Amino acid sequence: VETFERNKTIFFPGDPAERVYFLLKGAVKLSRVYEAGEEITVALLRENSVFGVLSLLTGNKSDRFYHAVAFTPVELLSAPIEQVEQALKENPELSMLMLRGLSSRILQTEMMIETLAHRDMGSRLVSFLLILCRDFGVPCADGITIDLKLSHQAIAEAIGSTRVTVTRLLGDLREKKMISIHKKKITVHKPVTLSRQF
Amino acid sequence: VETFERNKTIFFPGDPAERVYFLLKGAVKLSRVYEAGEEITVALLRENSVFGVLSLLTGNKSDRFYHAVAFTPVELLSAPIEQVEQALKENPELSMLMLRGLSSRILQTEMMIETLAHRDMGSRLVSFLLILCRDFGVPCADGITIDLKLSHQAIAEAIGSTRVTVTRLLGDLREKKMISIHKKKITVHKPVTLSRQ
Ligand SMILES: O=C(O)CCC(F)(F)C(=O)O
Numbered sequence: 001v002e003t004f005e006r007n008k009t010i011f012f013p014g015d016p017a018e019r020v021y022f023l024l025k026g027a028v029k030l031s032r033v034y035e036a037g038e039e040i041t042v043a044l045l046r047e048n049s050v051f052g053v054l055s056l057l058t059g060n061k062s063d064r065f066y067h068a069v070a071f072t073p074v075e076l077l078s079a080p081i082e083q084v085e086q087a088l089k090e091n092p093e094l095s096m097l098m099l100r101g102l103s104s105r106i107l108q109t110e111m112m113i114e115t116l117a118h119r120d121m122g123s124r125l126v127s128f129l130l131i132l133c134r135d136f137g138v139p140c141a142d143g144i145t146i147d148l149k150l151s152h153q154a155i156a157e158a159i160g161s162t163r164v165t166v167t168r169l170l171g172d173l174r175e176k177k178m179i180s181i182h183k184k185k186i187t188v189h190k191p192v193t194l195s196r197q198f
Numbered sequence: 199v200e201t202f203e204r205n206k207t208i209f210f211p212g213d214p215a216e217r218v219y220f221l222l223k224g225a226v227k228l229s230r231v232y233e234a235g236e237e238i239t240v241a242l243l244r245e246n247s248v249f250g251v252l253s254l255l256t257g258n259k260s261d262r263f264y265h266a267v268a269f270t271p272v273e274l275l276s277a278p279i280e281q282v283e284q285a286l287k288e289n290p291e292l293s294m295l296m297l298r299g300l301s302s303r304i305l306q307t308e309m310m311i312e313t314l315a316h317r318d319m320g321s322r323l324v325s326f327l328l329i330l331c332r333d334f335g336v337p338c339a340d341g342i343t344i345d346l347k348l349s350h351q352a353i354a355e356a357i358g359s360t361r362v363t364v365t366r367l368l369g370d371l372r373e374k375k376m377i378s379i380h381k382k383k384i385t386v387h388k389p390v391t392l393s394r395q
């Protein structure tokens with residue numbers, strides 16, 4: 001049962017793909033790193049997500065191309081692939097529960113595709129916030145608080161935008177009183193409202 | 199073994215999620231459908247893909263929220279979910295094979311995410327085209343031919359764009375001779391060179 005301070009790396013592009021991971025607490029960011037140094041987020045994982053699944057494919061004989069980072073402080077479990085395959089026999093039920101975990105991962109990615117598919121960057125941002133409310137939301141007076149410190153830069157890397165654009169967009173939303181920000185945590189008021197339009 | 203003609207629906211949003219599917223031949227399009235009929239593609243599936251995985255979470259208890267369409271003529275297998283659980287819990291390693299297929303679905307989707315992250319539509323297009331080269335490509339003398347009829351509208355629905363914009367971009371790519379198109383089949387000339395970028 002391993003822990004990771006916020007922003008520490010769990011695995012680097014190029015590392016052998018030998019382990020599978022289960023997220024216990026916190027959020028994990030998976031990203032692609034381009035030669036220049038720019039990261040694009042491909043996933044923001046919530047608690048109880050299986051990940052590192054490249055290792056279930058070619059296993060130990062192929063390398064990570066994503067970077068996994070503890071987006072908040074993290075606790076997780078991990079095992080080398082050969083150990084996981086075995087525990088599957090000794091438990092043809094664990095097997096079924098993994099299948100459900102991976103199915104959930106698939107559905108979550110598709111939902112981020114929907115988010116990125118919007119032409120209007122504003123709606124893209126609203127749609128991303130809604131996913132976050134679902135994944136990291138905590139109920140409160142004014143609606144739902146996304147329980148993560150979110151920099152504008154981080155939002156930008158997740159919705160294919162730039163810091164500058166995100167700042168402008170978060171501000172348009174605050175003016176309209178549709179969200180609040182305290183210590184970098186976003187509160188979305190009337191979330192079920194916003195769900196309208198898809 | 200079932201077959202579906204090109205453009206036939208395999209399942210509609212709101213249909214109970216009762217089966218899991220395995221695509222043997224052809225391409226299947228998963229899309230989100232909006233009140234007025236526009237559709238957004240969330241996946242173009244290639245041969246040998248498990249799909250319909252919502253029913254592994256919930257079986258027929260909940261409903262589909264994506265539209266599954268035969269993007270080309272299609273041949274597939276499908277089984278109700280309890281028949282699957284038995285097949286698995288009764289077949290230990292068949293289960294390791296599913297685990298792998300779902301793993302592959304996850305990585306394919308993440309690549310569509312990388313494709314959509316680009317801010318420049320030209321690059322979304324090229325990047326989408328290169329994925330299609332890997333998924334449905336047939337090699338030939340002038341590079342790789344995407345063995346799919348791809349209308350401009352279908353491309354637009356997959357990369358978050360309008361048709362007019364796709365047409366223009368495809369126009370650019372031909373003028374620059376990075377692709378040619380013949381009868382909706384796109385050939386990418388020197389894809390490995392385009393990959394770098
Ligand atoms: O397994 C990889 O190497 C990256 C992590 C993942 F993208 F595969 C994931 O499980 O989503």
Ligand SMILES: O=C(O)CCC(F)(F)C(=O)O
Nearest residue numbers: 249250251252262263264
């Ligand atoms: O099962 C769904 O409802 C649609 C198809 C799928 F998203 F589930 C899939 O397996 O990608």
